[PDB]
């Protein structure tokens, strides 16, 4: 129930999520980086890109964001699995955990509007070239967003339950 | 007579707030009089040039915190030029998020009380307190003619303790971020254990 307990739990989840998406993206590789440029459905959002912008952005705002970003990803995560059926294995893992994290996340907000993902056709693509571009973009984007959430959570924890110490 | 296709061979951020890249003069060609580094960022058409050719030293581009964003790809190129001609490095796609490798830890001290007590500090100019950076540490140590080292992982702690004979120990500590690269080991400290 405690604003503590929860934060501790969130970071634990976020950090674990970012790891899986790394390794999954990593083994997935086995020049696509060129088409991954501007390909993420969260690009639209106003996320802080700096320590200096993260600090300048308050508790409320910062947390809505986090929930949007997480809400945004159950769609693609789900179709990623749906479509797909170790590369299968990790995806089913990420879907669960993000679900638990958004849960813990929605708890935090009570005590203290999100972008749609439409790259589905693109995953079910006739030509193998395009297919792989769309899968690569997906994964690269998830690695990015897992990282960002993790870092944002690690941050707010320090800010609120540790007054920056 | 004209350069010398160059290579941007590494980038590194020591703290997610600034970063630096480095290039090598090219696979044989003439002596480049001048170097140029240009880049763009994703979500942007606008072409930039290195903000800072000095602080990183020889053949380097240093991006201050004013030019550093986490989570955004940088597409980069070095131009090498002569009175005779010029060549362009390959484009380098680089993301600050995945090139984090901190300095080594500072002020490794060892005290000898039934145990020995190791203490260190973060490298300077990391921002740990705020949550932005998260730093894991690790400790190695060895008697003086030992084949193999002994490594003890110490998590986010800035201190640690071992239980051992009457022997001289070299001890080193390194650090990594939650996700990224191990720093280099710090310089060794020495401690004798009495009887």
Secondary structure (H, E, C), B42-74: CCCCCCEECCCCCCCCCCEEEECHHHCCCCCEE
Angle at A155 (CA atoms; ends A136, B135), nearest 5 degrees: 80
Place of tokens 């080292």: B149
Residue B181: DSSP 8-state: -
Is the separation of the CB atoms in A77 and A94 below 8 Å? yes
Counting the structural domains of chain A, the total is: 1
Q: Coil, helix or strand for A163?
A: coil
Q: Which domain holds residue A54?
A: 1-165
CA trace torsion A22, A73, A42, A141 (10° rounding): 20
CA distance A18 to B171: 32
Cα A38 from chain centroid (whole Å): 16
| Burial profile A4-27: b = 16 or more Cβ within 10 angstroms, e = fewer | eebbebbbebbbbbbbbbbebbee
Q: What is the CATH number of the domain that holds A4?
A: 1.20.1250.10
Name the residue among B120, B130, B186 with its Cα closest to residue B155.
B120
Cβ–Cβ below 8 Å for B129 and A165: yes
Cβ–Cβ below 8 Å for A147 and B127: no
Q: What kind of experiment solved this structure? A: X-ray
Cβ–Cβ below 8 Å for B129 and A15: no
Decide: residue A3, CB within 10 A, 0-12 exposed, 13-18 middle, 19+ buried: middle
CA distance B191 to A78: 56
Can you point out the beta strands (E) in chain A?
none
Q: Phi first, then psi: what are they for B137, rounded to 5°?
A: -120, 165
Place of tokens 């702690």: B157
Q: Answer whether CATH 3.40.50.150 is correct for domain B1-100.
A: no
Is the separation of the CB atoms in B77 and B91 below 8 Å? yes
Q: What is the residue-wise DSSP string for B118-146?
A: EEEEPPTT---TTSS--EEEEEEEEETT-
CA distance B36 to B20: 15
Structure tokens at A123: 């995953």
Structure tokens at A17: 């999520």
Q: Cβ–Cβ contacts within 10 Å for residue A161, how many?
A: 14
Interface test with B, best of A151, A153, A154, A158 (most B CBs within 10 A): A151
CA trace torsion B39, B44, B45, B50 (10° rounding): -20
Residues spanned by CATH 2.60.40.10 within chain B?
1-100, 101-195
Is the separation of the CB atoms in A105 and A97 below 8 Å? no
What H or E segment, with its residue span, contains residue A9?
Answer: helix A3-28
CA distance B9 to A163: 40
Is the separation of the CB atoms in A138 and A6 below 8 Å? no
**Which neighbouring-strand residues pair with B62?**
B20
The CATH architecture one would assign to domain B101-195 is Sandwich (2.60)
Helices (H) and strands (E) in chain B, counts: 0, 15
Cβ contacts below 8 Å, chain A against chain B, sum to 62
Is the separation of the CB atoms in B172 and B139 below 8 Å? yes
CA distance B76 to B94: 8
Q: Coil, helix or strand for A119?
A: coil
Instruction: Give Rg (Cα) of chain A.
Output: 16
Decide: residue B33, CB within 10 A, 0-12 exposed, 13-18 middle, 19+ buried: exposed
């Amino acid at each position: 129930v405690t604003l503590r307990d929860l934060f501790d739990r969130a970071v634990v989840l976020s950090h674990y999520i970012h790891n899986l998406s790394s390794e999954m993206f990593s083994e997935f590789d086995k020049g696509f980086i060129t088409k991954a440029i501007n390909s993420c459905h969260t690009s639209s959002l106003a996320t802080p890109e700096d320590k200096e912008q993260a600090q300048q952005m308050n508790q409320k705002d910062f947390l809505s964001l986090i929930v949007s970003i997480l809400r945004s990803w159950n769609e693609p995560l789900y179709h990623l699995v749906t479509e797909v059926r170790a590369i299968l294995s990790k995806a089913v893992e990420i879907e669960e955990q993000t679900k638990r994290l958004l849960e813990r996340m929605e708890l935090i907000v009570s005590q203290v509007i999100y972008p749609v993902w439409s790259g589905l056709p693109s995953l079910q693509m006739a030509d193998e070239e395009s297919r792989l571009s769309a899968y690569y973009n997906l994964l690269h984007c998830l690695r990015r967003d897992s990282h960002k959430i993790d870092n944002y959570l690690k941050l707010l924890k320090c800010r609120i339950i540790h007054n920056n110490n | 007579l004209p350069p010398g296709k160059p290579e941007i061979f590494k980038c590194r951020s020591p703290n997610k707030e600034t970063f630096t890249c480095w290039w090598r003069p090219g696979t044989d060609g003439g002596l480049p009089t001048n170097y140029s580094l240009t880049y763009h960022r994703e979500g942007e058409t606008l072409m930039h040039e290195c903000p800072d050719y000095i602080t990183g030293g020889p053949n380097s581009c240093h991006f201050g915190k004013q030019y550093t964003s986490m989570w955004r790809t940088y597409i980069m190129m070095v131009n090498a030029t002569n009175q005779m001609g010029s060549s362009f490095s390959d484009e380098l796609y680089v993301d600050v998020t995945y090139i984090v490798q901190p300095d080594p830890p500072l002020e490794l001290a060892v005290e000898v009380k039934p145990y020995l007590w190791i203490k260190w500090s973060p490298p300077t100019l990391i921002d740990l307190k705020t949550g932005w950076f998260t730093l894991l540490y690790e400790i190695r140590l060895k008697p003086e003619k030992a084949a193999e080292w002994e490594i003890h992982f110490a998590g986010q702690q800035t201190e640690f303790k071992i239980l051992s004979p009457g022997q001289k120990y070299l001890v080193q500590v390194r650090c990594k971020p939650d996700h990224g690269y191990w720093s280099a080991w710090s310089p060794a400290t020495f401690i004798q254990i009495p009887s």
